[PDB]
């Protein structure tokens, strides 16, 4: 058996403009095995209106998943993606960095 730790990308569906509706994405990929926990967080609190894509995998057999939610970003609200996987000792939190 092998195990691969997830790569985690947190981003919007379109470039962010404060006050304009958008989608917040958390893309997890390259992980094995497939059981994984992903939450999107707003100001530290779990967003319960979150959808995810159906589990699939790439040609090297590693899995990927997209988690997403509609949102309207602002200057003050902070967002993050929290990922738990058997390859990690505690959940890993990745902040939405507005690039």
């Amino acid at each position: 058996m092998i195990q691969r730790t997830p790569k985690i990308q947190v981003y919007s569906r379109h470039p962010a403009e404060n006050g304009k509706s958008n989608f917040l994405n958390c893309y997890v990929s390259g992980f094995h095995p497939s059981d994984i926990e992903v939450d999107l967080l707003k100001n530290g609190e779990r967003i319960e209106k979150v959808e995810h894509s159906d589990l699939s995998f790439s040609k090297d057999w590693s899995f990927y998943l997209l988690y997403y939610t509609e949102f309207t970003p602002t200057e003050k609200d902070e967002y993050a993606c929290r990922v738990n996987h058997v390859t990690l000792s505690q959940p890993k939190i990745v902040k939405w960095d507005r690039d």
Binding site: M1, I2, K7, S34, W61, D99
Partner: protein
């Protein structure tokens, strides 16, 4: 140009939780069009692309029957594999399966695929001739001998050369405008100071389809493998894709770098630079 149909299966044993899970998704090119999940309320194959919803009820009922039986067969396969590897009854294990066809611009089969991974490693695969198998280890040779005696490769070759291409052609006609469509990326370069001496340049390609793209940084005209960070192409969530490439450069030398972008939808390859 070239097109492909692919089915992706994952069966996971969860002995401590109860029943295994079976998930299937089907793709045409980079577009998902069906899914099945043994863990849904009443499991059924479901449409995931607008051009497949026109299929009649016999389509979904026939395919649902296949996935339910596949889930049952895979559970027994997982029990066999646990024996082959002398593995503990305690833990969770994974069988992944991946098959389909690639056709050329004229719709002729270029290559068929049919391969399996156990616990994330190659296990057995149908060779390119679609008449023989490659086994990755001694355990996989148990399956190989069994499948040779069963004439298993002939059954799959017939599907890969016949119905696979035929359904692919039909999906390509049913979803022609979009399944086909080629959407160029919108591009731009960002700049972010890391310190007083270094900065990151990031080349973005956004909203493109299909997913195939080349994104490279050139310093003084020579490309920068070893020093370019390149994230996996990621889904936008609206059936298009995004990708960026990043390079850490000495501040003051940004303009020695160009980002080269080639995509099917771009009239000509693009050379982009940081613009302050």
């Amino acid at each position: 140009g070239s097109h492909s149909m692919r089915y992706f299966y994952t069966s996971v044993s969860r002995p401590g939780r109860g029943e295994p899970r079976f998930i299937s998704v089907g793709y045409v090119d980079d577009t998902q069009f069906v899914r099945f999940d043994s863990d849904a309320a009443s499991p059924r194959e479901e449409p995931r692309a607008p051009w497949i919803e026109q299929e009649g009820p016999e389509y979904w009922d026939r395919n649902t029957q296949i996935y339910k039986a596949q889930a049952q067969t895979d559970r027994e396969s997982l029990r066999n594999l646990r024996g082959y590897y002398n593995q503990s009854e305690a833990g969770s294990h994974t069988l992944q399966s991946m098959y389909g066809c690639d056709v050329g611009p004229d719709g002729r089969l270029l290559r068929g695929h049919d391969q399996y991974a156990y616990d994330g490693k190659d296990y057995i695969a149908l060779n390119e001739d679609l008449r023989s198998w490659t086994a990755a280890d001694t355990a996989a040779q148990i399956t190989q001998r069994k499948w040779e005696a069963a004439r298993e490769a002939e059954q799959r070759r017939a599907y890969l050369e016949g119905e696979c291409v035929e359904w692919l052609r039909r999906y390509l006609e049913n979803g022609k405008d979009k399944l086909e469509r080629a959407d160029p990326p919108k591009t731009h370069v960002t700049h972010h100071p890391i310190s007083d001496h270094e900065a990151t340049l990031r080349c973005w390609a956004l909203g493109f389809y299909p997913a195939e793209i080349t994104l490279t940084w050139q310093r003084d005209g020579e490309d920068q493998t070893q020093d370019t960070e390149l994230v996996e192409t990621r889904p936008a969530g609206d059936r298009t894709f995004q990708k960026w490439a990043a390079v850490v450069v000495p501040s003051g030398e940004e303009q020695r770098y160009t980002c080269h972008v080639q995509h099917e939808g771009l009239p000509k390859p693009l050379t982009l630079r940081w613009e302050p």
